[PDB]
């Protein structure tokens, strides 16, 4: 055939892939973390938005740190051979490098490690997107005019 | 050939390293509202990094906090695209 280029990911597999949305709104009292009012709005916007991109969306609410890790692990071991990509949206309290289960924090690196090129071979070479609505610290941006 | 085990990840963070991230209890988070709007308007038109750059500008320009507490009033936010992708990503195909 004619000349070919391959500067863009193949996104015409039979499925776009999973969109996992972890929406943490209510935290165990002993953590001292406040309820994240308005996050259900986010979860619904994301669900609809990625539905229209033809992602298989799964919304999960109020997961402990243990449930987050098991869910990432389980999801990483599914058959992704027919899926173009993988998306994970995390909505929660956080700090630099960290997001919070309802009962305490999870290292971001621990979540993403399940999908490493060598540990999730069905996703090797395929885009793995992590979208993170959470603190990365406590600095505030005062902005500048114009 | 091998590829790096860290290749082909994209981390779309809502805020710069070290910073608070803002969420509106009524409208949702600045970043997520902006991300969905820009995906809706441009997913059939722009490559993903260019979509996320529109999200950066939307959050940067259209939002500013309002607080009775002077420490938290009038603050701004810039999201943070971290890309280890090796190709362009279009959500549509030909």
């Amino acid at each position: 055939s004619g000349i070919s280029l391959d500067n863009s990911y193949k996104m015409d597999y039979p499925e776009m892939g999973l969109c996992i949305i972890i929406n943490n709104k209510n935290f165990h009292k002993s953590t001292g973390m406040t309820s994240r009012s308005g996050t259900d709005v986010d979860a619904a916007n994301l669900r609809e938005t990625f539905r229209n991109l033809k992602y298989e969306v799964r919304n999960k609410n109020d997961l402990t740190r243990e449930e987050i890790v098991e869910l990432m692990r389980d999801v990483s071991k599914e058959d992704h051979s027919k899926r173009s990509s993988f998306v994970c949206v995390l909505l929660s309290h956080g700090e630099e490098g960290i997001i919070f289960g309802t009962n305490g924090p999870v290292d971001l690196k621990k979540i993403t490690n399940f999908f490493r090129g060598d540990r999730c071979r069905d996703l090797t070479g395929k885009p793995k997107l992590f979208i993170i609505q959470a603190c990365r610290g406590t600095e505030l941006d005062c902005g500048i005019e114009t | 050939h091998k590829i790096p085990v860290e290749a082909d990840f994209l981390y779309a963070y809502s805020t710069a390293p070290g910073y608070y991230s803002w969420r509106n209890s009524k409208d949702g988070s600045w970043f997520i509202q902006s991300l969905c709007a820009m995906l809706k308007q441009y997913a059939d038109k722009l490559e993903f990094m260019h979509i996320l750059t529109r999200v950066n500008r939307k959050v940067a320009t259209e939002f500013e906090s309002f607080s009775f507490d002077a420490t938290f009033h009038a603050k701004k936010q810039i999201p943070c695209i971290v890309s280890m992708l090796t190709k362009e990503l279009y959500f549509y195909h030909h």
Partner: peptide, 4 residues
């Protein structure tokens, strides 16, 4: 407006 609240922070996360």
């Amino acid at each position: 407006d609240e922070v996360d």
